[PDB]
Amino acid sequence: VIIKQGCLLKQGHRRKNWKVRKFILREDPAYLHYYDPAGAEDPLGAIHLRGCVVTSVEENLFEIITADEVHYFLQAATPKERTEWIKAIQMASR
Ligand SMILES: O=P(O)(O)O[C@@H]1[C@@H](OP(=O)(O)O)[C@H](OP(=O)(O)O)[C@@H](O)[C@H](OP(=O)(O)O)[C@@H]1OP(=O)(O)O
Protein backbone atom coordinates (compact mmCIF):
# COMPACT_ATOMS: atom_id res chain seq x y z
CA VAL A 1 0.00 0.00 0.00
CA ILE A 2 1.42 3.33 -1.12
CA ILE A 3 0.78 6.12 1.33
CA LYS A 4 2.03 9.03 -0.85
CA GLN A 5 3.89 9.61 -4.09
CA GLY A 6 5.16 12.66 -5.84
CA CYS A 7 8.30 14.34 -7.06
CA LEU A 8 10.85 16.28 -4.98
CA LEU A 9 14.32 17.61 -5.59
CA LYS A 10 17.03 15.72 -3.74
CA GLN A 11 20.52 17.09 -3.07
CA GLY A 12 23.62 15.05 -3.85
CA HIS A 13 25.91 14.07 -1.00
CA ARG A 14 29.29 15.20 -2.38
CA ARG A 15 28.47 17.64 -5.16
CA LYS A 16 25.40 19.52 -3.73
CA ASN A 17 23.46 19.60 -6.95
CA TRP A 18 19.69 19.03 -6.90
CA LYS A 19 17.98 16.36 -9.01
CA VAL A 20 14.29 15.72 -9.47
CA ARG A 21 13.30 12.27 -8.19
CA LYS A 22 9.97 10.50 -7.94
CA PHE A 23 9.30 9.38 -4.39
CA ILE A 24 7.04 6.54 -3.21
CA LEU A 25 6.28 6.27 0.48
CA ARG A 26 5.19 2.89 1.84
CA GLU A 27 4.32 2.02 5.47
CA ASP A 28 4.61 -1.70 6.25
CA PRO A 29 7.71 -1.54 6.60
CA ALA A 30 8.31 2.14 6.19
CA TYR A 31 10.41 2.95 3.13
CA LEU A 32 10.71 6.02 0.88
CA HIS A 33 11.91 4.66 -2.48
CA TYR A 34 13.00 7.12 -5.13
CA TYR A 35 13.29 6.73 -8.92
CA ASP A 36 14.64 8.71 -11.88
CA PRO A 37 11.56 10.46 -13.37
CA ALA A 38 12.68 10.06 -16.91
CA GLY A 39 14.53 6.77 -16.62
CA ALA A 40 14.89 3.21 -15.27
CA GLU A 41 11.85 1.38 -13.71
CA ASP A 42 14.15 0.08 -10.99
CA PRO A 43 14.53 2.30 -7.95
CA LEU A 44 17.66 4.36 -7.48
CA GLY A 45 17.54 3.82 -3.75
CA ALA A 46 15.41 3.60 -0.66
CA ILE A 47 15.33 5.41 2.65
CA HIS A 48 14.53 3.23 5.71
CA LEU A 49 12.24 5.53 7.84
CA ARG A 50 11.87 3.67 11.09
CA GLY A 51 13.45 5.90 13.73
CA CYS A 52 14.24 8.71 11.35
CA VAL A 53 13.84 12.41 12.23
CA VAL A 54 12.50 14.89 9.66
CA THR A 55 12.73 18.66 9.97
CA SER A 56 11.72 21.70 8.05
CA VAL A 57 14.80 23.79 7.19
CA GLU A 58 16.38 27.14 -2.49
CA GLU A 59 13.24 27.04 -0.36
CA ASN A 60 10.60 24.58 0.79
CA LEU A 61 13.62 22.60 2.03
CA PHE A 62 13.48 19.75 4.53
CA GLU A 63 15.90 17.16 5.87
CA ILE A 64 15.61 13.47 6.86
CA ILE A 65 18.22 12.03 9.25
CA THR A 66 17.95 8.24 9.26
CA ALA A 67 18.63 5.89 12.16
CA ASP A 68 22.08 5.23 10.73
CA GLU A 69 22.75 8.97 10.66
CA VAL A 70 22.50 9.60 6.90
CA HIS A 71 21.15 13.03 5.97
CA TYR A 72 18.95 13.56 2.95
CA PHE A 73 18.12 17.10 1.87
CA LEU A 74 14.89 17.48 -0.16
CA GLN A 75 13.07 20.42 -1.65
CA ALA A 76 9.29 20.65 -2.39
CA ALA A 77 7.65 22.90 -5.01
CA THR A 78 5.36 24.69 -2.52
CA PRO A 79 5.18 25.16 1.26
CA LYS A 80 2.01 23.03 1.37
CA GLU A 81 3.77 20.09 -0.32
CA ARG A 82 6.62 20.37 2.24
CA THR A 83 4.14 20.30 5.11
CA GLU A 84 2.34 17.27 3.71
CA TRP A 85 5.51 15.33 3.10
CA ILE A 86 6.93 16.02 6.53
CA LYS A 87 3.66 14.95 8.15
CA ALA A 88 3.44 11.72 6.06
CA ILE A 89 7.10 10.79 6.73
CA GLN A 90 6.75 11.36 10.45
CA MET A 91 3.69 9.16 10.64
CA ALA A 92 5.39 6.36 8.71
CA SER A 93 8.53 6.53 10.95
CA ARG A 94 6.75 5.30 14.03
O1 LIG B 1 26.56 6.05 -6.61
P1 LIG B 1 25.65 5.85 -5.43
O2 LIG B 1 24.21 5.46 -5.76
O3 LIG B 1 26.30 4.94 -4.43
O4 LIG B 1 25.54 7.28 -4.69
C1 LIG B 1 25.01 8.44 -5.35
C2 LIG B 1 25.75 9.67 -4.79
O5 LIG B 1 27.09 9.46 -5.20
P2 LIG B 1 28.30 9.28 -4.13
O6 LIG B 1 27.93 8.35 -3.00
O7 LIG B 1 28.47 10.63 -3.59
O8 LIG B 1 29.43 8.68 -4.94
C3 LIG B 1 25.16 10.97 -5.44
O9 LIG B 1 25.76 12.13 -4.83
P3 LIG B 1 26.83 13.13 -5.55
O10 LIG B 1 26.66 12.86 -7.00
O11 LIG B 1 28.12 12.48 -5.06
O12 LIG B 1 26.63 14.54 -5.04
C4 LIG B 1 23.62 11.08 -5.37
O13 LIG B 1 23.19 12.22 -6.13
C5 LIG B 1 22.98 9.81 -5.94
O14 LIG B 1 21.58 9.99 -5.79
P4 LIG B 1 20.49 9.31 -6.74
O15 LIG B 1 20.59 7.85 -6.30
O16 LIG B 1 20.95 9.47 -8.18
O17 LIG B 1 19.23 10.07 -6.36
C6 LIG B 1 23.49 8.57 -5.17
O18 LIG B 1 23.23 8.71 -3.75
P5 LIG B 1 22.06 7.94 -2.99
O19 LIG B 1 22.65 6.83 -2.19
O20 LIG B 1 20.97 7.36 -3.89
O21 LIG B 1 21.41 9.07 -2.28
From Swiss-Prot:
Molecular function as annotated in GO: phosphatidylinositol-3,4-bisphosphate binding; protein homodimerization activity; protein kinase C binding
Boundaries of every PH domain copy: 1-94
Keywords: Acetylation, Phosphoprotein, Repeat
Annotated GO CC locations: cytoplasm; cytosol; extracellular region; membrane; plasma membrane; ruffle membrane
GO biological process: actin cytoskeleton organization; cell projection organization; cortical actin cytoskeleton organization; hematopoietic progenitor cell differentiation; integrin-mediated signaling pathway; intracellular signal transduction; negative regulation of calcium-mediated signaling; negative regulation of G protein-coupled receptor signaling pathway
This protein's record includes keyword Cell inner membrane: no
Function recorded in the entry: Major protein kinase C substrate of platelets.
Name of the molecule in the record: Pleckstrin
Native source organism of the sequence: Homo sapiens (Human)
